[PDB]
Amino acid sequence: MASDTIRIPGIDTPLSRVALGTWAIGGWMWGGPDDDNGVRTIHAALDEGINLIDTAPVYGFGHSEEIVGRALAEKPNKAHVATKLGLHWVGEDEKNMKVFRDSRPARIRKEVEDSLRRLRVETIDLEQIHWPDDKTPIDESARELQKLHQDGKIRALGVSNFSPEQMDIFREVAPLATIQPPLNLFERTIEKDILPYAEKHNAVVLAYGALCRGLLTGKMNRDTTFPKDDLRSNDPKFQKPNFEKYLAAMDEFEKLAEKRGKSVMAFAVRWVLDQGPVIALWGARKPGQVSGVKDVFGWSLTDEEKKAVDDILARHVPNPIDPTFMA
Template sequence: MATDTLMIPGLDTPVSRVALGTWAIGGWMWGGPDDDNAVRTIHTALDAGINLIDTAPVYGFGHSEEVVGRALAEKPHKALVATKLGINWTAEEKDRKLFRDSRPARIRQEVEDSLRRLRVETIDLQQIHWPDTKTPIEESARELQKLREEGKIRALGVSNFSTEQMDIFREVAPISTIQPPLNLFERTAEKTVLPYAKKHDAVVLAYGPLCRGLLSGKMNADTTFPENDLRAQDPKFVKPLFLSYLAAVDEFKEMAAKRDKSLLAFAVRWALDRGPVIGLWGARKPEQVDGVNDVFGWSLTEEEKNKVDDILARHVPKTIDPTYMAPPERD
């Protein structure tokens, strides 16, 4: 059972340092949904001691939230739910377009919709998914603070915000969590978000700690991705660069084996060792939760951290952030 925890400001319950990420459960961009298996996955995560479930309306256009709501309604639990808002989409199912939208009226509607889909009266952690530069940040923050004062939200967070944007938000409302990409290959947050979080008493929810499966250890030179798979748009997964990443993965795998750990546990542990970090462990099948407890009870040594840096310097010295995932601004 997971025992390593952090306190998120605004929440009374200690939070497991691994949270369940549910993007894939929504089905969109992940080959379609499998609801019964998704519910079993959430139950398996709860049994493993994970008590924070992270979701978002855009994960399947409401479907992920609905599945999370169903799963938590079917099993006694003490889980906390984190969701997001600030991404809107067009009505048509084919060639659907996303765009950022954090206008106050949209925020209020999204919170009401999330409460209904999640089957809860209060959202434990509400985050803005991406900054909407066409809406003043203070207007968005003010509406979220109103919803918090109304008892519909317990704590507030932001995702993919710059430090300057967070400063503006904090003039109006507190930031309890910050959610950036952070993994062995995507490390920009180390220099920006992590120092900011430490200074302002916020917790970092690191998304993509397994770098969309690259750090699972299950990929090889023959691995390919269909056109509708988001990884087909990521230069890290395109040859010849893909081969350089795989070479680094092989060395990380050897390091993990010396500690009698899986590569997954090694990769997530590296992220947790950065500071006040909770790692999002994405899964859509119960077996994908296996091994989560191998993350706890140990840390990388300084020698191991230095060796990680050396491996990266030799194979992939330039950080490539997942900017291709950013939705466009609205027209």
């Protein structure tokens, strides 16, 4: 029965193993009528049985959180909100905004107050350090967070983009409930350290980027290109000659998915779920983009499907050979 839900230590109700990611919801710092789609998107997520919404102050510099707070106030629900802290913005708008890492305790206390207000809650269900601050010892940050938990302002605590050593330091001072690392079929680096860490220390993994920036949607082809503005313009995976290798892998993944009558998009996300104690974050800007969530639930990859996946990767996108000699 427990293949569609998982418990997060410190939160009573089980969470759906797909969570709504909100980087495309109020992702611009100035709002407007377009905020209505974001609200409708959250509402659609809730109706698909998603009860975890992941957001962050940095998304639209408060705006995403405001939309989540708004949406949750308009529709009866039992959603849980995970948010983040540790990124500091200075400036007026999108043009001159400066964003830096800041996990100083005073900034932490302020960010929690701000998130409580924007989300319209009295307690944050899950608070995550967005990035490790190189200028503040992890200890200082975890100490502040553990205190606010005791004040009853936060339920569970997590981190993102921490090394195992950084997580060990955090855990000496505060209980670690979750870890938010990047993971997808084409980007499995965290398998070597983060996943085993999560298993050994009983943390839940909130995986982001399950669709590898669109490559795994099944909607790209040999003709897909990106604007100078688009991050993918300078991403080797989306460039000659690599892009075709990835597209090639995609065609096989697609045939594999077809055998189950699943889309490649749903297959890619289900793969992510089946790597461990994992919740996959699912992004959406409009309510339509949430319909596919349904396809992820109610099944799991067989060991043969998992092997086929590895076979497909090895056949098309084999890991680069290290420059240094190796016996």
